Amino acid sequence: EPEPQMVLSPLTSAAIFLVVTIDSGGEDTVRDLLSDVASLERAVGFRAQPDGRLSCVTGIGSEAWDRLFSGARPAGLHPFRELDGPVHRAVATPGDLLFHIRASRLDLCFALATEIMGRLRGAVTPQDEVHGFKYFDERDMLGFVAGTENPTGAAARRAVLVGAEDPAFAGGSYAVVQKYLHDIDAWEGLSVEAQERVIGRRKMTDVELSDDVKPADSHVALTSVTGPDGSDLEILRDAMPFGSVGREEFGTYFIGYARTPEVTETMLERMFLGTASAPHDRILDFSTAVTGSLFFTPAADFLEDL
Amino acid sequence: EPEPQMVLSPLTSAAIFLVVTIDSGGEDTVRDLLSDVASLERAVGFRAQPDGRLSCVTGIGSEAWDRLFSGARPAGLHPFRELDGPVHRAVATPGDLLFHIRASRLDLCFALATEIMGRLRGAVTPQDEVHGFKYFDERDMLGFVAGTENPTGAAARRAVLVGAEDPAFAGGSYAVVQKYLHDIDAWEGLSVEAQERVIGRRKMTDVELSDDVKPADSHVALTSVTGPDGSDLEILRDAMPFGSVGREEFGTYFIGYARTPEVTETMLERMFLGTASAPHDRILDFSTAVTGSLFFTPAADFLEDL
Amino acid sequence: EPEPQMVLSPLTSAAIFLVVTIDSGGEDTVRDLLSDVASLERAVGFRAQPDGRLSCVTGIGSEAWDRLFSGARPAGLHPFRELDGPVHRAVATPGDLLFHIRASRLDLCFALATEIMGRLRGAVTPQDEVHGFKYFDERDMLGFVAGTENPTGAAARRAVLVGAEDPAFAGGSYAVVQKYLHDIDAWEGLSVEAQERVIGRRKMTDVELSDDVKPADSHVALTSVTGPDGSDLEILRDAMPFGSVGREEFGTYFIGYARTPEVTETMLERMFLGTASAPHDRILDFSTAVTGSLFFTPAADFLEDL
Amino acid sequence: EPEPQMVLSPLTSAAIFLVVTIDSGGEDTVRDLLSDVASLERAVGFRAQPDGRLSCVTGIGSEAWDRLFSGARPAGLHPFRELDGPVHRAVATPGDLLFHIRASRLDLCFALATEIMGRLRGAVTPQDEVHGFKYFDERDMLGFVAGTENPTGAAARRAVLVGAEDPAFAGGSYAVVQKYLHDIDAWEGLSVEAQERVIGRRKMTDVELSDDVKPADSHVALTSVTGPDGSDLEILRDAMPFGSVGREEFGTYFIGYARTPEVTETMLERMFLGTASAPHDRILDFSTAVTGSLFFTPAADFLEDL
Amino acid sequence: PEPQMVLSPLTSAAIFLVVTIDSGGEDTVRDLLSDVASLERAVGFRAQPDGRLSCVTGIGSEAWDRLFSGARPAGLHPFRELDGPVHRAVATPGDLLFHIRASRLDLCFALATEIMGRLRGAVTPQDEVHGFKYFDERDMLGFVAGTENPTGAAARRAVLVGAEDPAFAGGSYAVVQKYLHDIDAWEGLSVEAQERVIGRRKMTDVELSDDVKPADSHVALTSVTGPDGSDLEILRDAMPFGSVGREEFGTYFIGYARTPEVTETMLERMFLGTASAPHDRILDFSTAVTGSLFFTPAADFLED
Amino acid sequence: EPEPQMVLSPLTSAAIFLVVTIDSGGEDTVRDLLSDVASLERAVGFRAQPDGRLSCVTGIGSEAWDRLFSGARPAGLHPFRELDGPVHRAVATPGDLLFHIRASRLDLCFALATEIMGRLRGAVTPQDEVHGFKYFDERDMLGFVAGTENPTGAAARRAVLVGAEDPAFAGGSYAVVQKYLHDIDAWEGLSVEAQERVIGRRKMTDVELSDDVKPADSHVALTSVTGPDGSDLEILRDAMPFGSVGREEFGTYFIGYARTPEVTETMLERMFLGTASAPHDRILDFSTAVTGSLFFTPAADFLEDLS
Ligand code: HEM
Ligand code: HEM
Ligand code: HEM
Ligand code: HEM
Ligand SMILES: [Mg+2]
């Protein structure tokens, strides 16, 4: 088999997301760092095992792919598509390389980002840096448990990893990132029961609302999607709270992994464009997207053989 | 028996430092929050015990003291004094209120900061916000172990807490804060042995250099101070690394606690102004101060009664 | 000078409460066990240290005291007083001996209870046995954080331990126990905001309601009491959830420790008999008392002396 | 593949065993709960991961199966078979549904039991509820280590999961439960060496007795069984201590999982009816069975597609 | 005065180092003594809070007179040999003791390495033992070890020199003996017979009742009452050690007390017996091959 | 397919290495103990789960194999080959049985060793006994992080376990042991930068030196080897510090596992005999080998199905 990157990670309480663009002439410096990134992860993380749980997933954008590599393109790799809905917009922002860094502690994420950015100085321009923290009981910036219905084990592997549909790229995945800022004032003005109707779960106990009470425009209803077979279409998410209390900046950095970008893009269309029964996802009345990018995260042996 | 604030804390791997100025007319809102800050600490932290280890130490500046309170001033409270050395300068920057927030996780620091700044909205202007992280083996941004020679137990209590010398304020302490930015490139250009001559301890094993090889201008030599009786004068320090890899900002946020600011100010004079044997602390050839402020952290019962 | 029992314990996730009456002729068997109870605690607990945190607090009722001992009575020892309110009743039930057994695991509590009851077979009749468990985020059976405003450190010692006011019994405490069963159907019919008006704290974040919106008949308002000097009167509580899902028994086992029973009894009078502004504690509309007893927990050296 | 339920769980120190009958007319409410039980397990357990280790195994009895489902039946599903031995009896008691709930803390077990029974109120009658706790060194109520010779990994999967011998029910297992009470007075009247001859292993070190000293009527000799091919026949056991010190109730709740009930029933016949060499298992001279039931635990996809 | 870390948290690992001071080694020794506390902080700090590293430094009677002028601690004298009818407590040489404890052997070894590095060419090693506790606090005989140690203020009153010897307040006396066990003979006894040797139940660690506890059980003989009828207590941290290949199965005994009189009265009852007991039955399965006595000064004494 | 022994273990901070020779006539006692070693592991270890992480890997030497078992030999089992280099020697020392015992605590390793040796008394003679401890940040006796480039997961299983190339022994592995003593005085006389040119990685941060600076005779350059297709050949290491401060004994006990002894023996030839670019591994100028032995660690089912 090919060795995937650590897409399927254990639960982690800390993350750094780095998005960067490749300057004129930066290609060779980038290809060098890509062939070393797995060995840098071992160097920073190994001495802190078993508690550190440090990992890095590397993604490459559509335009960056053609600057870096000759030969085939992964069949689903394209630039993020903007959605201009009746009320809400999903923007596209620039990005060539993503580093999704996770661990039990921010300091280990920081030490790996420092070695990666040290090797790229003068080849890349930073577009975004986010220092994520999960709340001690797995809660998100809105006060709800985050991750409950993610797939696990073999269902997670089937949902996330490219297979025989695109054999040269088996063991890869597609990552969509969006930085959201929340209107926390408007959100905390709702009763808990009104917040539960926005999400589609109980806030304190995390039990799903039944199909007879769950509104059509609740976040859980709109991100539930069935294929032609009537099989559930799933993705793997690891969204992280972030912010600054001084600047009144309270955010969710969304990341979702899927075997094909079509599943994530169908969920975004239902959220932003609505359906027959729902104008839009109620969660977008409290959350504004300010970034949007799409990346292919190759199998680790692809990056190693550079 | 006055109750000190949690100046003497267990080791913590995460911190938020908040420094704000009090807007004109903000006095009443500030005095209200001060009388509730201990109950806010309990509310956010209690449900995360015993691993959270959340605490908040609240400091008040010299000029803020006069706007907030009638009656006595603590004997040692004055504005931070600028040091204009031949090569290096310790700047004085504005601050009325300090919140030193510590825990095992950044998310807990953030939830308490969020409730404090919620209560002060419209009454204060943010001057500094720093999210600190300690490395997993107690190392700082320069790669050295940080905290080793801090006093513990009764020696710590005698070094840090105001007593019979100023009985109205017994159980208070004085805090000095300074934000440093490092020249990491210049630092990593030194051999380990040359780094050890700058600090005055072995890098890997944390053993102090013997008095016959320790340079007079090493950091440990200059911050070792004896009183008139020939006793060691100690302070309690809890400096944290911080940074942004995107902006190439690699920093140490210094905080020192002492029973009287004279001990901390004598250390700063030796570091910046030098002695007969040393022009300046060699650590300042790799570290620039961009803030400097001084605060009195009163006994907890003082804040509770106002 | 006297050694208190482990009244001030570290947080524990498991407990057993054993209340027994002394059969006629049981006196000598009981006095023998009381002089050995500390050595049994060490025998069961030592091999699980330091994580086990096994402790047993032993209490003696007013009528039992007179059967067991000649000489002085603790000044405040009397039988629990029944409270006959217009709507709610605090019943008095028999109890000669209390064993308050706490640890990080149920199995350790059970092994010490097994040795204690082994020594007392044929000298005592069991009146109550409760196996308590804490929820993983310090929540009680109603879904609220329990323990938040307990006193700590020196304020805990001052609030709980008998001193110079009763010198022969210094290092003792008084314990009040009540078993409550909840109407969980009626409780879960309230909105979260209506539950918050019953307790007097926010449910998810545990922040106290501000003094102008906290109802006078909320639980927190009625159990806040000021002495003549204007000081807060405090007790130390370690209440535990318990239950059987099959019998629909959802309960709180209340225990409160105080230096004098007057403080605990003033809180119970406000809850059950009301004030000018509150007919009764709203928590009693969802909580029925089915036991009530009062015990003196002597200094450890008092039990050893026998 | 079919997905099995969590029959092969990690070690857990807490359990709840719930056995109910289905009331007349209750069928529809039960089939609803069965299709939701996995979603309830994720909802209660997710926020405690990865330490919580919460899992629920659902079993259905022979008579209940015929009330709930039409069509083909698991080949081995029948009501528990009573064993009337010369001295000892294995009773059959009523049970239609089993919930085997396991976690690292009792409170997590209790919260999932509460949500299961909340959905079944008015459709089922409780027959048995046991709160199990393991001793801190894996010991049982007799003072011996319990679980040592359980199969692990692939040998465990082969021992427990239905395969090609019953292809419509692949991924299922058969569970036998028995609640035992011990005569602890009679037991503790044996020497350690006499206790070792009852079990067939050393008490302090858990080393199996040599084939030259292991008695024919020791527990390990009688539950050791070889098939016609000379392979070991294994089951997976997760027996838990339970009891009440006040009632002098000291028990073991036995559960055994096997791919066919023939293996568990051959072990029970040797224990209760004896063999050529042994009248009965000596463990039954200190252990009385007061319940006995048999359940089929289907693959998880069976329960989901209801 | 600040005591050394005599009263430590429970630890699962220890190194015991006993050395003699070579002629001319005195100055090198006095230099290392004034730095041992800063070496403990250096090695241990970065491994907090799990490390639990401490070093207790002791000085023998003969070594005291070579190192220091002025007062002697009142109770400091050479370990006394006990020539009993059946069992012997030997006296073996020892000038300096380092009792190193932590959660992990590697931390003990790193501190030992820095101490012995500073003393190279000034000292000769007499004994080095790497100790390990079993996961349920059991010792080499299979019994729970440490159960009756005093705690808190009763421990401080039992262990630390006070007003009776004010120049040395905050010090303690340490007695060490290395024991080797006859494990074959021991495992030949029934559990019940082992319980009569110790005076405690093996599985549950409950003390035997006063009507069944033999007079020559280990717990009966090491129970000693003062004139007022109070228990005289010591603090013990004995550790298992061994080599499986050389069939060496041992207990390294260390006991701390405010005066050596308490520890020496217990050793006289064990080895010489009384009217009621020939000797401690534990000595029929345990041979002492070292014996030494040290004063562990207050930490401020080592600093000055 | 079959059950391997616990060759691929979780990280462990404590280990006991026991090497013994089988006395004449000891064969039957040895074969008895081999069929019980897995049940002895369960007995001592189960009650300490989940923290104990106790395991035992049992190895059999080439000459012991012939005395114990009458059928086929594993294809690669032979006595350790001595390497007589210009400067440095890798000696071959006697050993018939290896017990590689690992856990989170030394006491658990010691209790299993005690039960194993109890069953073997009078049938075997002890040749080596080492009580190993790892430093709290995975560092070795030289102060460098040890284990960093070990393979993990499926790459580890492919590197270590016998498969279709030798089907009767599938799920087995080959273990090489060497006890090294260090010259710590000579080592601590080097600058940190000079230590880094000996190893080939940075001491504080464990980052590999660039291909532009990494010397030909650094330890990392010489133990990197590519097969004919240009794939890396890998082994799995679990080397442990050991010592006695009194005797000035500071050591590393090396153990390496591989699917074929040819990978480990090629690395040892480059270290001790050198190449075109390097006379010898610079690590050997501060490390002397005092033992060397080779063992086959069979599949667990092989030990169990015995007599
Ligand atoms: C804008 C900020 C967002 C927040 C705060 C948020 C929050 C949540 C929460 C609380 C849940 C329920 C617990 C869980 O299953 O994790 C959830 C579920 C989910 N979210 Fe989001 N979400 C956000 C954005 C998105 C986006 C952008 C997507 C996909 C494009 C998405 C897809 C999902 C999916 C697929 C589920 C699982 C649905 C199910 O139960 O089947 N979410 N989210
Ligand atoms: C660049 C900013 C700073 C860095 C990176 C730094 C770093 C360190 C380090 C690595 C040590 C040795 C380990 C320890 O005992 O903590 C130390 C010691 C110390 N530092 Fe700093 N320091 C900084 C600024 C300051 C300032 C501004 C002062 C005082 C005004 C100070 C006071 C001390 C003192 C008192 C010691 C203890 C020395 C002793 O008695 O051994 N440091 N510092
Ligand atoms: C081979 C050497 C030794 C072994 C294996 C050993 C073992 C034990 C054990 C298992 C206990 C009972 C539980 C507890 O720790 O309280 C005990 C108690 C004790 N031992 Fe020892 N011991 C040894 C040597 C010594 C020596 C030489 C002394 C005194 C000089 C001593 C003094 C004590 C004392 C005072 C107690 C507590 C007595 C009490 O219950 O008041 N031990 N020992
Ligand atoms: C004194 C003995 C030794 C010491 C102190 C030592 C130390 C080291 C160190 C510190 C590393 C780097 C980090 C890592 O991957 O672990 C390493 C790597 C390595 N050592 Fe050793 N080692 C020793 C002996 C040996 C021997 C005898 C072999 C093989 C016969 C060996 C094979 C390796 C290999 C294959 C690597 C990984 C290199 C790579 O591909 O990056 N070592 N060793
Ligand atoms: Mg009975």
PDB file of N, CA and C in Angstrom, chain E residues 47-65:
ATOM      1  N   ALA E  47      12.415  17.879  34.822  1.00  0.00           N
ATOM      2  CA  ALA E  47      11.595  16.652  34.839  1.00  0.00           C
ATOM      3  C   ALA E  47      10.415  16.795  35.773  1.00  0.00           C
ATOM      4  N   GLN E  48      10.174  17.966  36.356  1.00  0.00           N
ATOM      5  CA  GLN E  48       8.982  18.209  37.221  1.00  0.00           C
ATOM      6  C   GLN E  48       7.752  18.282  36.311  1.00  0.00           C
ATOM      7  N   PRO E  49       6.535  17.927  36.811  1.00  0.00           N
ATOM      8  CA  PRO E  49       6.323  17.557  38.216  1.00  0.00           C
ATOM      9  C   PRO E  49       6.412  16.052  38.578  1.00  0.00           C
ATOM     10  N   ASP E  50       6.625  15.177  37.597  1.00  0.00           N
ATOM     11  CA  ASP E  50       6.648  13.703  37.778  1.00  0.00           C
ATOM     12  C   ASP E  50       7.967  13.235  38.414  1.00  0.00           C
ATOM     13  N   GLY E  51       9.106  13.916  38.205  1.00  0.00           N
ATOM     14  CA  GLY E  51      10.452  13.376  38.515  1.00  0.00           C
ATOM     15  C   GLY E  51      10.587  12.945  39.968  1.00  0.00           C
ATOM     16  N   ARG E  52      10.178  13.828  40.868  1.00  0.00           N
ATOM     17  CA  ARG E  52      10.243  13.721  42.347  1.00  0.00           C
ATOM     18  C   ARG E  52      11.695  13.459  42.770  1.00  0.00           C
ATOM     19  N   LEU E  53      12.693  14.071  42.126  1.00  0.00           N
ATOM     20  CA  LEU E  53      14.104  13.753  42.440  1.00  0.00           C
ATOM     21  C   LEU E  53      14.502  14.418  43.761  1.00  0.00           C
ATOM     22  N   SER E  54      15.145  13.687  44.680  1.00  0.00           N
ATOM     23  CA  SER E  54      15.804  14.298  45.861  1.00  0.00           C
ATOM     24  C   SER E  54      17.105  13.544  46.194  1.00  0.00           C
ATOM     25  N   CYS E  55      18.032  14.211  46.871  1.00  0.00           N
ATOM     26  CA  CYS E  55      19.260  13.604  47.423  1.00  0.00           C
ATOM     27  C   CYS E  55      19.389  13.979  48.890  1.00  0.00           C
ATOM     28  N   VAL E  56      19.497  12.993  49.759  1.00  0.00           N
ATOM     29  CA  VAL E  56      19.825  13.221  51.188  1.00  0.00           C
ATOM     30  C   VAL E  56      21.282  12.805  51.391  1.00  0.00           C
ATOM     31  N   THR E  57      22.077  13.741  51.936  1.00  0.00           N
ATOM     32  CA  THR E  57      23.527  13.597  52.126  1.00  0.00           C
ATOM     33  C   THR E  57      23.808  13.389  53.626  1.00  0.00           C
ATOM     34  N   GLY E  58      24.495  12.291  53.938  1.00  0.00           N
ATOM     35  CA  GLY E  58      24.898  11.983  55.319  1.00  0.00           C
ATOM     36  C   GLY E  58      26.394  11.881  55.486  1.00  0.00           C
ATOM     37  N   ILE E  59      26.850  12.180  56.695  1.00  0.00           N
ATOM     38  CA  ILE E  59      28.287  12.211  57.126  1.00  0.00           C
ATOM     39  C   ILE E  59      28.460  11.299  58.339  1.00  0.00           C
ATOM     40  N   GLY E  60      29.444  10.408  58.300  1.00  0.00           N
ATOM     41  CA  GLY E  60      29.743   9.497  59.417  1.00  0.00           C
ATOM     42  C   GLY E  60      30.486  10.164  60.566  1.00  0.00           C
ATOM     43  N   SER E  61      30.633   9.426  61.663  1.00  0.00           N
ATOM     44  CA  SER E  61      31.264   9.915  62.918  1.00  0.00           C
ATOM     45  C   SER E  61      32.739  10.300  62.706  1.00  0.00           C
ATOM     46  N   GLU E  62      33.522   9.393  62.110  1.00  0.00           N
ATOM     47  CA  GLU E  62      34.966   9.557  61.822  1.00  0.00           C
ATOM     48  C   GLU E  62      35.181  10.657  60.804  1.00  0.00           C
ATOM     49  N   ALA E  63      34.342  10.687  59.769  1.00  0.00           N
ATOM     50  CA  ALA E  63      34.434  11.685  58.670  1.00  0.00           C
ATOM     51  C   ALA E  63      34.159  13.089  59.255  1.00  0.00           C
ATOM     52  N   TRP E  64      33.206  13.212  60.200  1.00  0.00           N
ATOM     53  CA  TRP E  64      32.799  14.486  60.809  1.00  0.00           C
ATOM     54  C   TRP E  64      34.045  15.185  61.348  1.00  0.00           C
ATOM     55  N   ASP E  65      34.887  14.449  62.068  1.00  0.00           N
ATOM     56  CA  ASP E  65      36.083  14.991  62.771  1.00  0.00           C
ATOM     57  C   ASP E  65      37.140  15.392  61.733  1.00  0.00           C
TER      58      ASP E  65
END
